[PDB]
Amino acid sequence: GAEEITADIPNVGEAALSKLDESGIVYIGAEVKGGDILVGKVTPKGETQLTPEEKLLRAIFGEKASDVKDTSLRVPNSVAGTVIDVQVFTRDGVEKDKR
């Protein structure tokens, strides 16, 4: 399918989404450190085989949300700075997000 730039990043809490806007792009002027999410992107993934131990673990606790995988842009390690400019390039024929 088509990869989407959205803030709905699986297995990530609202602590890491504070600097992100509704469209999933970091604000301008945000103090970001290593490992912080700048742009939130989710990639579609196919069916993945689960080991029998993992199947039992899912049987006990029913949590399972793995429709998409987290492939998002993150600040490189040992790099700390401020976001001073963000530029979005969209292909002709693709809907423009709010940002």
Partner: protein, 231 residues
């Protein structure tokens, strides 16, 4: 006698300028002038408390690497200029907020900062920024904190709203210290010396007070040796 020494006293204080002074300690025995002078110079240059700007908030500014209309200087230059602000905060308060609003063309200086009467600006002529238009306006909220030593912005332990700008703070008010040991004419003895300490500061700290804090620190550290035991 030989066992008993003579204790120095603070005999003269001279204020050549607001940021320059000389303090005289007299009398001193042989060799004690250099010892006390070096100890006091090292303590004064390292461990003197002060007040410094830590956080700035400018309306319409999101980050330091930006520009504001009608201002010749960038926000980085304004913060660097704010780093040189000499502020004295009344005792009992370790945190204060001051406010600077100015409109119209001209040099925005430290004398235009509105305080609460518990904050004294020692250098009212310090140029903070320049407004190059009659329509230009500046509105800033400055945070002044009491501290000791040098605390960079990164060293501060980590919500902080976007628009609050961290400033590296050098709290120590002492800039330069020199000391000279000269001859002193006391009674009939010649071995007695006199210690003159030249202090160049930002004007926040009084010379006598700084001398007493340095002596207190030295005595408190010496108390461990005065009562040497295995701990």
């Amino acid at each position: 006698s030989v066992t008993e020494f003579l204790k120095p006293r603070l005999v003269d204080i001279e204020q050549i300028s607001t940021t320059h002074a000389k303090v005289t300690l007299e009398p001193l025995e042989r060799g004690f002038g250099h010892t006390l002078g070096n100890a006091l110079r090292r303590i004064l240059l390292s461990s003197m408390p002060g007040c410094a700007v830590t956080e700035v908030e400018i309306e319409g500014v999101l980050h330091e690497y930006s520009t504001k209309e009608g201002v010749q200087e960038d926000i980085l230059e304004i913060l660097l200029n704010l780093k040189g602000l000499a502020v004295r905060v009344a005792e009992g308060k370790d945190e204060v907020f001051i406010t600077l609003n100015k409109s119209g063309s001209g040099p925005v200086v430290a004398g235009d900062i509105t305080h609460d009467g518990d904050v004294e600006i020692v250098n009212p002529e310090h140029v903070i920024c320049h407004l190059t238009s009659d329509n230009a306006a500046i509105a800033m909220r400055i945070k002044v904190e009491r501290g000791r030593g040098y605390v960079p912005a990164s060293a501060r332990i980590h919500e902080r709203p976007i628009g609050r700008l961290l400033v590296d703070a050098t709290f120590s008010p002492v800039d330069k210290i020199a000391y000279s040991v000269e001859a002193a004419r006391v009674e009939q003895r010649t071995d007695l010396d006199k210690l003159v300490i030249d202090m160049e500061t930002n004007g926040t700290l009084e010379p006598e007070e700084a001398i007493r804090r340095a002596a207190t620190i030295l005595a408190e550290q010496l108390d461990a040796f005065v009562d040497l035991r295995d701990v």
